[PDB]
Structures are given as structure tokens and as C-alpha cells.
Design a protein around this ligand. Structure first.
Ligand SMILES: Nc1nc2c(ncn2[C@@H]2O[C@H](COP(=O)(O)OP(=O)(O)OP(=O)(O)O)[C@@H](O)[C@H]2O)c(=O)[nH]1
Ligand SMILES: [Mg+2]
Lengths: 101, 67, 82, 75, 80, 69
RNA sequence: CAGCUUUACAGAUCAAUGGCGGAGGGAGGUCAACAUCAAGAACUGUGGGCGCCUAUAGAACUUAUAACGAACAUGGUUCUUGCCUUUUACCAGAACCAUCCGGGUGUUGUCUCCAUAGAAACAGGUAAAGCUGUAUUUUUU
């Protein structure tokens, strides 16, 4: 176990699309955009990322009830214990998302 | 019976809403679900005791964590 | 919008085959597609209707001439349908 | 860059030696000079000539040819 | 061969469909997607030409058939 | 409305397959939404040139192949 | 406004067949009993390949300024301090732990107040609900 946390498991939250397809897609360039979302302090960029991820995946474990409802933001991309408790995105916790245009 | 037009009838009751089957769970009195304007009324009435600080920043170096 | 044309443009990048009204098949990486199937390929083998294969670097095609397009087994999976 | 509409406007003002090939047709060509232009590819051609293909100068005059069956133009 | 007395084409989607073509071939397979211009996406498309004797046969898999070069559609078999 | 992206092939020689097994070599000058190829005329299929500057109709196009890389 | 699909009608032949059937209540309760809620962010079943790996269904509740409670006590043990000096009783910190006031769901059952139907479609029509529809270069003139 550990405090400064991630998933550490076989059962990663299942995606709407299938990750096999995603990886297949990632075979060729001209079809892999590296976004690297950027901005000031509390732009909402991490929240935007979270929105995208949630949109993508079926049910996440960490997506508790309240966050689902939309009281708290499911800050899905501040995995570090600190990055939670401090209220800041601090390191690069991006995601690979088969995104539909 | 104008500003306080909705709550006035029931605000002073033993159980605020014994029936009012829409607004509460029932007589067990477990859950509630008000409409907007009555909530507004409640808010206005609560001006003396209400939290009355929206700027969440305000508790800076005054949170439980800080303590 | 055309849900088969949707699939075509989603199929860009894969090694796709293509036969026209002329009967001359093709096979290579797709590059570009539009509403009217204005197809482009790379690394395309160009077999004539007799069977005479001619390897070439690229090709552009007009949609009116296209007959059918062999898509891989990956587009069977996701994500256009549901 | 030159769209076909602008290149045919050059062929319109010039009226220079045009040679036309025809749609769904290899047996015959045309030789004249562009005189008209429609919003469709319809173009009237004066001094046009029917020219069978090099597998002679056969008779033909001024023609409004329906332009949806065009292949080549070159003034 | 059996099929329901269907109203339109989209209602019988994902059915094994014999699809004629103007060049002489017939493409047989379960249809995934249709169009306003009759472009078709057969899940398990199978290329069957009629050479000048007996049927020519070839397997394709997932393929787009352009609508203009279709003659007609016929139901060959059921789903699954 | 969808403009065929020939700006990759602009000002380059192209082997245009056209109706009746006919070929057209020639450097590209421009185009339109119908794919009508405005091109500098070259030798037509041993081999012989007809015209100086040509405009091929889109309906008559079978294909157009990258001669130049 | 047209097509299709769904419902309330009137009578139908009632074949065809479906499907809602070997059709059987709801709302509640200061009402119980049972399960269960701090854990590699975390749960459970199912198959298969050898206690485990591998695909599959599922997952209420409670949470990320971490917690069943937007709330707040108490008791014990030790360790540290203070008042003191003899203990209870205590001061207020720690680490451990427990008790207690409560809470959540889920399932059963009861208690109550209301109820209380064993058959409706097809051919259409009537009316209402869910989608689509209103040639001159790449789809069909
Ligand atoms: N009112 C309002 N507040 C928002 C909105 N989006 C985000 N916020 C608030 O501002 C914060 C910005 O989003 P976060 O994702 O938490 O911050 P961040 O983008 O991670 O900022 P960095 O840590 O600098 O990347 C959130 O914690 C929210 O409280 C919005 O749309 N409206
Ligand atoms: Mg003594």
C-alpha cells in the first residue's frame, strides 16, 4: 500500500472505447496529438482534463458520489497526495485518450 | 404573507413538515426536498445565523489544516 | 453526414485496398478523404485489371470512380458505431 | 494558383488555338478557339473543326457544345 | 432462405446480405452501416465475381461498398 | 464545399489517369471543387504533347498519380 | 402536412403470430430483524488457463482540504507535562486503544393508509406519443 497514490492494480477503470483500438490507432503518426494543456494558476486545466477523462471512461473508482454529482471537481489528474492536499497540480499527470472529433 | 409567503404557514411547527408529502420523505422525517422559493425564504430568514462568507479564500491560514 | 464516409476518414493511416470502376485494385496507407471520396494513398501497389502490378509512392483518386474499399479489422471495434 | 474558371477567362479573351477532347469518346477530337463561357462548363466554340484521332481535316463550323461532356481544352 | 416482412433497409441491419454490383460481382456479408447515397459497410464482406462457367470467390472482411456501383440488395441470412 | 487538398500536389508533375485508358503528364497550375485540373500540358499516351496549358474536367478523371515526390 | 413505430377507443373474422402469463399491488411507518459499511482507492461474482493467472458480468453506501456525523463527547492504558504533592478527582498534549450519542444503505419481514385488474394487439379508421421526408461533374437522372 501507499499514501502518494495511483491505481496499483489489474482492474484499471474500463473505457467506453477499447484500449486495444486506441493502441492500434497509435500505430501511425498524423493520428497522435500531444496536447499538453497549459495555463495560469487555477485555470481549470486539470478540471478540464478530468472532464475529458470521465467522458472517456465508464465508471472510475475515484469518481465518488459527490464528484459525480458535481459539488467537488473530480480532479482526476492530481494523483499525488500533496497535489490533492495542497490544491495544486504539481507534476505531469496526463492521459492517453482515444478522443472523438 | 408577501416576502415570507411560503414558509410562514409552516415555519413554526413541531416537525416543520409532518405531511407535505412532496417536500419531505414522510412522517419518519428522514429526508427533505424543498422547491426554490421556500429555500430562498429560509435563507433570508437565516441572515443572523447563516454562515455568510462565500469567498472560500477567506479562511486563509485559518483552516483546520492551518490550526 | 455519411456514416460509411465517416468510417473511411476514420480509416486514414491503415493499409487499405481500393478497386475502382476500371477494376484496377490498389493497396497502401491512406492519407486523405472527404465527403466525395477524394482518396489519397502512400506506398501503393497498383495492380491493373489484367493483374500487372506496378509499385509506386503515392496516388490521388476521385470518388466517382471508386467501387469498394478494403478496411482492416480494427475499425470493426471502435468508436464510430457505439 | 489558377482555378479553371480563371484559365478559361484567359481562353475567352485570347481566343487562341484550342483543341478539345470529348467525354466517353476516344475516336474523335475537336480543334477551334474558345468564344463563350457558362456557369456550368458549357462553352460555345467558333472556328471549331472535327479532327479524327491519330490512331485529315474534316468539316465543322461554329458550335454550342454541351459542356458536361468535355475532357480537354488548351488555348 | 428466411427473413421478416421488413418495411425498409435500416430495420434489417446486421443481416447477412447478398449485394449485387454493376461490374458483375456480388458482395455477401452482414451490413453495419448504410447511407443516403446507399454507401454500405459490410462487416464480413465476401467478394464473389461471376466469370465468363462457375462462381469466383474471395474473402474481404470489413469493407466499404460505394453506393453508385451497387445494383441492388438481397437478404441472404440472419444475424449472429 | 470540401476542397480537395491538392496544395500538397500544387506546382508538381502528375500522371492523370483519364477516361479510356488515356494518360496526362503535366505540372499543376490550379483546381476547383469539381476536381477540374488546371495544368501545364505535357506528353499524352509512343508519346506526344497536345497543347501548352490544359484544363481537364473532373468527371473525366480516373485518378492522378504522384510523378514527383 | 406525408411515411413508419407506439398507446386510449368501437366493434370486429379472429387465423397469423407474437409478446405483459404457466400474468397477483402501491405509498408510506421516530416499526423491527438480518447483511454491511476506513480498504493495495480500497468491492464482488462469473466463466476459462494452470492457490493463483486470464477474458466476462456487475456493483447500493461512504468519502479526497479525506472520510459513515459537514457533529461531537467520554473511559482505559502507557509516555510526557501542569495543579500539586497522598489518592480520587483533575491540567493538556502524545501514542495507542475502547465506550457511547447517533448515520447510511441493501435485503427481508411485519404495521398502517390507500388499493384491488387474468388478458390487451392483428385489418384498418379516430385521437395522442417516439424518428425520417419535403436532374444539368462524385452517388439518384
Ligand atoms: N466558478 C468556477 N470555478 C471553477 C471552474 N473550474 C474550476 N474552478 C475552480 O478553480 C479551480 C481550478 O481548477 P483545478 O483543476 O482545481 O485547478 P488547476 O487547473 O489544477 O490549476 P493548476 O493546479 O494550476 O493546474 C478548481 O479547484 C475550482 O474550485 C468553473 O468553471 N467555474
Ligand atoms: Mg496513606
Amino acid at each position: 500500500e501507499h499514501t502518494i497514490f495511483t491505481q496499483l492494480k489489474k482492474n484499471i477503470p474500463k473505457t467506453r472505447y477499447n484500449r486495444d483500438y486506441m493502441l492500434s490507432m497509435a500505430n501511425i503518426p498524423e493520428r497522435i496529438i500531444n496536447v499538453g494543456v497549459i495555463g495560469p494558476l487555477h485555470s481549470g486545466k486539470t478540471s478540464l482534463m478530468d472532464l475529458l477523462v470521465i467522458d472517456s471512461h465508464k465508471r472510475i473508482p475515484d469518481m465518488s458520489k459527490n464528484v459525480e454529482l458535481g459539488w467537488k471537481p473530480l480532479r482526476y489528474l492530481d494523483n499525488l497526495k500533496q497535489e490533492i492536499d495542497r490544491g495544486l497540480s504539481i507534476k505531469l499527470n496526463g492521459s492517453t485518450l482515444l478522443c472523438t472529433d | 404573507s408577501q416576502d415570507d409567503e411560503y414558509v410562514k404557514d409552516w415555519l413554526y411547527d413541531s416537525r416543520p413538515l409532518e405531511e407535505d408529502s412532496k417536500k419531505v420523505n414522510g412522517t419518519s422525517y428522514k429526508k427533505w426536498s424543498f422547491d426554490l422559493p421556500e429555500m430562498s425564504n429560509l435563507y433570508r430568514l437565516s441572515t443572523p445565523l447563516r454562515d455568510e462568507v462565500t469567498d472560500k479564500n477567506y479562511y486563509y491560514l485559518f483552516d483546520k489544516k492551518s490550526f | 453526414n455519411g456514416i460509411p464516409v465517416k468510417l473511411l476518414n476514420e480509416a486514414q493511416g491503415h493499409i487499405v485496398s481500393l478497386e475502382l470502376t476500371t477494376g484496377a485494385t490498389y493497396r497502401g496507407k491512406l492519407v486523405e478523404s472527404e465527403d466525395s471520396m477524394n482518396v489519397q494513398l502512400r506506398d501503393v501497389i497498383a495492380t491493373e485489371p489484367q493483374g500487372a502490378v506496378t509499385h509506386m509512392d503515392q496516388i490521388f483518386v476521385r470518388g466517382s470512380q471508386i467501387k469498394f474499399i478494403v478496411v482492416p479489422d480494427l475499425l470493426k471495434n471502435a468508436p464510430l458505431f457505439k | 494558383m489558377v482555378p479553371p474558371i480563371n484559365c478559361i477567362f484567359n481562353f475567352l479573351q485570347q481566343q487562341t488555338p484550342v483543341t478539345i477532347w470529348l467525354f466517353e469518346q476516344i475516336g474523335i477530337r475537336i480543334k477551334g478557339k474558345i468564344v463563350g463561357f457558362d456557369e456550368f462548363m458549357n462553352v460555345v466554340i467558333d472556328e471549331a473543326v472535327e479532327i479524327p484521332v491519330n490512331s485529315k481535316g474534316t468539316p465543322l463550323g461554329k458550335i454550342l457544345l454541351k459542356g458536361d461532356n468535355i475532357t480537354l481544352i488548351t488555348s | 432462405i428466411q427473413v421478416a416482412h421488413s418495411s425498409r433497409l435500416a430495420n434489417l441491419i446486421d443481416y447477412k446480405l447478398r449485394v449485387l454490383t454493376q461490374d458483375g460481382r456480388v458482395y455477401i456479408g452482414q451490413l453495419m452501416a448504410f447511407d443516403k447515397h446507399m454507401n454500405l459497410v459490410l462487416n464480413e464482406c465476401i467478394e464473389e465475381r461471376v466469370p465468363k462457367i462457375k462462381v469466383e470467390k474471395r474473402v474481404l472482411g470489413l469493407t466499404i461498398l460505394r453506393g453508385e456501383q451497387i445494383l441492388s440488395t438481397v437478404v441472404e441470412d440472419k444475424p449472429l | 464545399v470540401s476542397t480537395p487538398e491538392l496544395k500538397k500536389y500544387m506546382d508538381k508533375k502528375i500522371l492523370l489517369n483519364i477516361n479510356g485508358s488515356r494518360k496526362v503528364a503535366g505540372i499543376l497550375r490550379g483546381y476547383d471543387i469539381f476536381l477540374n485540373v488546371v495544368l501545364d500540358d505535357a506528353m499524352e499516351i509512343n508519346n506526344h504533347q497536345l497543347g501548352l496549358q490544359t484544363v481537364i474536367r473532373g468527371n473525366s478523371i480516373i485518378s492522378l498519380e504522384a510523378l514527383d515526390a
